[PDB]
Amino acid sequence: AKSKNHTTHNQSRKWHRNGIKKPRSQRYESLKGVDPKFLRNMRFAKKHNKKGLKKMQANNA
RNA sequence: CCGACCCGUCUUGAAACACGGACCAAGGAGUCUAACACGUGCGCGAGUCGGGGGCUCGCACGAAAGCCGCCGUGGCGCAAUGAAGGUGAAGGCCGGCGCGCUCGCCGGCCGAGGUGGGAUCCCGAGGCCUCUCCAGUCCGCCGAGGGCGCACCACCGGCCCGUCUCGCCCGCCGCGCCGGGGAGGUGGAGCACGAGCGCACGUGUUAGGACCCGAAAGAUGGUGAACUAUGCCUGGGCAGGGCGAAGCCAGAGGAAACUCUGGUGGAGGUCCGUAGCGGUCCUGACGUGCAAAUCGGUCGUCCGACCUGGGUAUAGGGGCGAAAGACUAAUCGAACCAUCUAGUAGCUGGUUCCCUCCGAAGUUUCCCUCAGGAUAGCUGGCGCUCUCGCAGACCCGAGCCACGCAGUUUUAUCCGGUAAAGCGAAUGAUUAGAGGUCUUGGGGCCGAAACGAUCUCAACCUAUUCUCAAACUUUAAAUGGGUAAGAAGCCCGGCUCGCUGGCGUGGAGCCGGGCGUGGAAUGCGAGUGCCUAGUGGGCCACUUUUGGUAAGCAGAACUGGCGCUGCGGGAUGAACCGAACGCCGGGUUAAGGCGCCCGAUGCCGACGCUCAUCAGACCCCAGAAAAGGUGUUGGUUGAUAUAGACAGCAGGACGGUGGCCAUGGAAGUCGGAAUCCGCUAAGGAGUGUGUAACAACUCACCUGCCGAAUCAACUAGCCCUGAAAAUGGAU
RNA sequence: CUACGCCGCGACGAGUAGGAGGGCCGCUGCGGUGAGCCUUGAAGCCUAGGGCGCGGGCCCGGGUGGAGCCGCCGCAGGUGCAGAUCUUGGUGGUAGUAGCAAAUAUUCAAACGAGAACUUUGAAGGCCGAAGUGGAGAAGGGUUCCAUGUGAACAGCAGUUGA
RNA sequence: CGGCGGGUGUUGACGCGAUGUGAUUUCUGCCCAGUGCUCUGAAUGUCAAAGUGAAGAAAUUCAAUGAAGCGCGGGUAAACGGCGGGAGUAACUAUGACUCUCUUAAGGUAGCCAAAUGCCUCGUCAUCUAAUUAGUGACGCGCAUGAAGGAUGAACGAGAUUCCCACUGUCCCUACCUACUAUCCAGCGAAACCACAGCCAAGGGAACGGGCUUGGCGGAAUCAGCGGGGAAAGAAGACCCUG
RNA sequence: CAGGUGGGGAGUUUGACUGGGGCGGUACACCUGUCAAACGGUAACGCAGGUGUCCUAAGGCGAGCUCAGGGAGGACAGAAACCUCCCGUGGAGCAGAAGGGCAAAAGCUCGCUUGAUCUUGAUUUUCAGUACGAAUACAGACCGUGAAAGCGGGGCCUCACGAUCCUUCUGACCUUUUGGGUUUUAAGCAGGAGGUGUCAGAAAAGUUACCACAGGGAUAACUGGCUUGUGGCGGCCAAGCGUUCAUAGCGACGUCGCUUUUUGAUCCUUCGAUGUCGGCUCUUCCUAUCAUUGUGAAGCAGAAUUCACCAAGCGUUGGAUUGUUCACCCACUAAUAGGGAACGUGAGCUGGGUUUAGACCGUCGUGAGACAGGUUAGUUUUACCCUACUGAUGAUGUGUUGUUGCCAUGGUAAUCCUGCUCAGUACGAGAGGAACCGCAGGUUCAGACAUUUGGUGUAUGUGCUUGGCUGAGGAGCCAAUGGGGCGAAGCUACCAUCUGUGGGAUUAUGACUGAACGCCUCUAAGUCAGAAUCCCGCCCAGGCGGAACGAUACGGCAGCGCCGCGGAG
RNA sequence: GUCUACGGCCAUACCACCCUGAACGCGCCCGAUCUCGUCUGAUCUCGGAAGCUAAGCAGGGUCGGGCCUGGUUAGUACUUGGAUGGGAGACCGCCUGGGAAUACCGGGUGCUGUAGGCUU
């Protein structure tokens, strides 16, 4: 009739059998969720980043 | 000799007083079809596939195999997106004019962009050679650095379809409520130089009998009234007695009315009681029977609603019922037969060869969910992407030493409100005095009179005081949780922006360049994908912990274990202690032991404690408390004593005063208070016994004998009392 | 050096539910193959016989048997049993046991016969006691009726008797 | 199922059909609010299809009209059923003849009772006995009696109960006898049941062992009994829960 | 065809959790504090509570103020009316439960308003990292307020809520409406609403004792096990009672235990079944002893009684009522003690009760039906197996066989009362009133026995007798023992009769001597007495235990014993 | 050495009382025509400059309260890990590491940024 209601016994062992892996950190974290206004200006900056290539190459030279 | 409980099964737990199993032989349970998904093998490959048809002596095989190609119709793939109308996946650079106006017409190129990683490949300064050198003949190896970068991953851009917001243009045989564009967000199972198709095999899920066996039921169509129930037809049957209804006859008594008496008669759902029919009690017999309802005795009725044969009628959700849900062929709260039907089952039982490797869960969320599923977790299988190097034919390295990871520490840096602590800190609770001056405190001895007064109790205030808190708190641990400890870092410049803006401002992005002592310890090779079974009843122990008197109770946290696990020890034992396991030999241990059972103390083991007429004897653990002991052993504190202890024996133990008041006597001793002095060595105006009260004993106080240590109160070891249960018995 | 082979070094080995691999483990049938085996003896069965393998299992000897069978490479299954109050068949212990006890009752002699408690005849003693244990029918049975013969089985002992 | 089909019905209210109660005797009280049943529509509320009218191009929409039924209103309790409270009130208290009220409608009349109906209860009182949770009689604010069923009343009953006489082996308290068994023999010859089996104490253990541990111990093969055990057999518990 | 009626009939349903289920409750969807063990998470029908709403302002801005309370003043005015000053860290208020938060605030009073509006995404919370709900940060419009910075897309924060399908409304000069076109209609796209509270969301009343099936010891009713609140029985302290005096006998306030003979709590075993109350019968065990034996104490003069010790050997009864266990009464008694053994005991019985099916009453229910309410009637099966036990043969071994024996071991048995005498004695003022020895008998029990008395009697012994039968007499028989009187033997009855037993060590206890502790002391060493107990005797059986003794195989080849170390094996 | 305006940290800064304040400043102060608000020019707003440090403010003082920081409390309480340690239990001791809080007793009583003044 009545049964055990809840337990976390053995759960920690189950969690550590395959290890509790941290999230896979890597370069270039995603841009989703960032402020839309700042994001659209960043897109504009990237689009127009091509112009001034001659100036950048002359300065580098 | 040692070890050894009976297997299977469900179960937290089986040798179980849990179920199945007397024995043996043969049979006996995950199959086939279809549809999916993924993996693997094969062929072809932007294709692929003839499976349906046809052609080929119509045929032993051959119902096969071979071929078709204007039989590829068609299926699947090659294009997506939208409800739909419909629409429908190529960018980059280099130039001139419009204003190179976030840009329109073209040119000329290349043909899916870029960043960071990236196996492999390429170049490579410099090194390696011999009998030797100044000077080159040719190829092999190592090699710092640099380059092109597969697949794949992360990110940023771009393209297609839907849908919003904004805004300016363009096109025309239809100038329109027409058509087409652009920018910025956002929705898509998309594009971004295809990977599919067919066949085979495996695994998983599913629909089908669906691993095998199993309901109570439901439906369709039939067979039964030979038993019984009831109606009808036509037959048969029921000793002997008792009571004595109406009708009738006679006699008697009566003034009459009429009454009485004796016969006769033979009624009755009448009585006793055969046969018949039934079936009360013995709760008799029997109870694997004579019998799937019988037998013995005892019983009910026995002229009637009586018993009975045969013939008939009523048939299943129907009949029939003097009614019990009774009876309807040993079947009735819905007969029997066949079929649908191998009905369904979240439930029970079973489920067939060996070895090897890996190896669980009883938890999360949802469910008319609680004996079940889905889901995540735990498992297995298949891989794939990388890292370290592999070394020298034998021999022989010639600061600096892998991508990365972690149930760990260290170094910094945060987080917390438990334990503890606190209440002369807040909020609640709570004890006691003290000191104060006001009051709707009671009031308060003589004060109405100005309580002339000021004594007391309250409340209040002040400074203290005792005790507390899971749902209080100033303070505040231990254990714990997060982050960081570099090349994705640090530092220099430069470019872009429509965001931001006093500003060469801020911020973000991008492009070059330089920095390597690789910036704690320790250990370890990592990353990533697909498919996936079983499980989803748990239980136990230390510690924390809630409810409960408690529980071998119920409920949580942490870790470990049992389940799933054998072995050594605990005599015995799922969980305790040690330790985890291939088959063996030698050595040594753990926990635990070493009188004998029974391996080992058969040591000239050490020091003590302890006697029990219920001794004691080892984690869990299998039994005990308060309170006692002049049993004994230690210890603590105090006290006395050669100015003579303690104990024994022997002396004294006096006056006021028979002290005050209680009285009926209380003289030291029933009592209420007081609590002295003189003689002293000592004497209490009294320790108890005692008396009516006295008296008499005796103490507390001194003295004599005795000559050396003694007394008291505690304390904690072992032992004893406390300590009573049922078959005879358990270190 | 059967490269699906051979060799070397190091570490490791518990296991239910469950997953996977290997099987020169086993059964049946099909395509190949063994110039396979076999009446000078196949399958099957039995065996204090000899062995191999961790094991599933297998080979060989002896006996019996009397006509078919197996190895290897592939293929395909109605392919492996201790259980299911399993299905069918057979067999034990129980066990020479329970039992052959309702309705009073048999005895003597003889015959037949291998054989007599049970048959038949005779003599006794009893019972049913006319609402019968008597004599005849209906339903139902279907040859049980009646003679002769047999002594297998049946008549829960026997039988010379019998439905 | 169906036919103007069929049963009652070869019938006709002294008859068929449907109910309740249950001979005789004696009574059968109050309640029509509820639920039923039934009766008249009295304007009258609601109320389908069809039909009618309007709008519309039509589909369609709207409106009017209003069958039965329900609703409204009467009757009905030998229809189902129900028959409680509260306030005041008599010259001892106490009760309430009397007067009012509330829920609905009426408040349990006549009778009967610790009854086969009463919990408390083994009620209280009388009787019966030495002793009575029994019996009878009586009382009655009766948990929760009661009138087509109440209260009686002869006869009857394989109905339930109590007492008395007689009678007895029911008992004190058992014994003996008979028949058939059982028993033994000749013949014949099953079945149930069966993991293996079968001596105990304690321990631990699924918390009551035949097996295990520690002890006690253990001597072929059997016969007649016996009913302590085998948590004996018989049946997949019928109680309880779940599905 | 339409409407009404329609359990006459059909089909179906009649939640879940749950210290069994039902009744109760909601721990079923949520929120606060605690539990919770200082990150987060964490359970029980854990604790204290709350929720299914309310608000055009209680939403949004801005401005200005300060709240609760207290002190001191002021006509009525007082503890509370209003006015003024001062103190006032919030001790108030913020809609509600609680917690957090808040002072020129988030509170109060005003002014203006509608950001409680139109949109796309992201994120947090529960989480599977699904949804809903709620929430956070942005972005794009359109606004409100303020001088402005700013703030606002509901409420200071933590809760206040809801899928598919369907319906309804709103929006796009939107899409489709099937050969084309127009118009109604319908379908669609996007967003609100109508709701599932069992709150991830079926459309749902009972009863069954006439019942059924698949199961469950996952789960109750009876045993057992853990526990011991409750029940029962004890202990410690001693305020008091006891004329006096705590403790002869008691024991308040407290406090420590034991028992499993009560009742609970739990749910470990059993649901392919462990027969469930009581009585009857019978055995054994416990002691917490009612009586009896031996004792100690007293508020013990005697008698009677009370308390305690060793102690379970022995006994603990006959009846009325009731099914009863209990209970109560009558009567006897030495006493009429309490318990266990699967609440001992159903293949031992009985079946009164509970607890099937029939039936009546009362109450409940519309009804079927229900009722730890009453009443009545209601099938009690099997042993032949194994062991246990009771008896009965046997078996091992001594060469065979017999007689006579011993005793290991096991069992074990006696009990209680009355009368006389002691003795009208001790004691006592008196009334009353014992005991030891001895004697005579009983009760219960045991073991026998049959002379006597009684019972039986099928000696089928002998008379009598009924009905029938053999022709009658005589003699008999049949009637399941025809009936009846008397009856031998045998068996048998407290229904007759006989018999029933000694010692030892000791317990409790009282003592001796005697230290410890120059005293005392039953104790420490050493001694004594001492009992229904214990052991043995007497009595019953006689070991896989012995002893002594006897006889030990032919009238025929036939066996055996002793002697020999005699031999060969 | 100070002040003013705006501040940062937010008591070492707060609170109670007393003393001192030169120069600027900050204030008190005067008034209501305008701006603007009131029951009230008290507040708010505005226009001023006779007087004053009386107050605010600043500095100082108090065996001051508080606050801040040390000591003591105390290696105490508590606690990680361990034992076949003790005890009938309740609980306690030890090993291994960590380690508080009152009461009581000391010291301290704002630091500072920007901009602008005064102080011989």
Ligand SMILES: [Mg+2]
């Ligand atoms: Mg569970």
Ligand SMILES: [Mg+2]
């Ligand atoms: Mg099972």
Ligand SMILES: [Mg+2]
């Ligand atoms: Mg279980």
Ligand SMILES: [Mg+2]
């Ligand atoms: Mg088992």
Ligand SMILES: [Mg+2]
């Ligand atoms: Mg058991």
Ligand SMILES: [Mg+2]
């Ligand atoms: Mg079972």
Ligand SMILES: [Mg+2]
């Ligand atoms: Mg069986």
Ligand SMILES: [Mg+2]
């Ligand atoms: Mg079987």
Ligand SMILES: [Mg+2]
């Ligand atoms: Mg072909």
Ligand SMILES: [Mg+2]
């Ligand atoms: Mg085509």
Ligand SMILES: [Mg+2]
């Ligand atoms: Mg790349």
Ligand SMILES: [Mg+2]
């Ligand atoms: Mg992208």
Ligand SMILES: [Mg+2]
């Ligand atoms: Mg799948």
Ligand SMILES: [Mg+2]
């Ligand atoms: Mg099947």
Ligand SMILES: [Mg+2]
């Ligand atoms: Mg159905």
Ligand SMILES: [Mg+2]
């Ligand atoms: Mg018939």
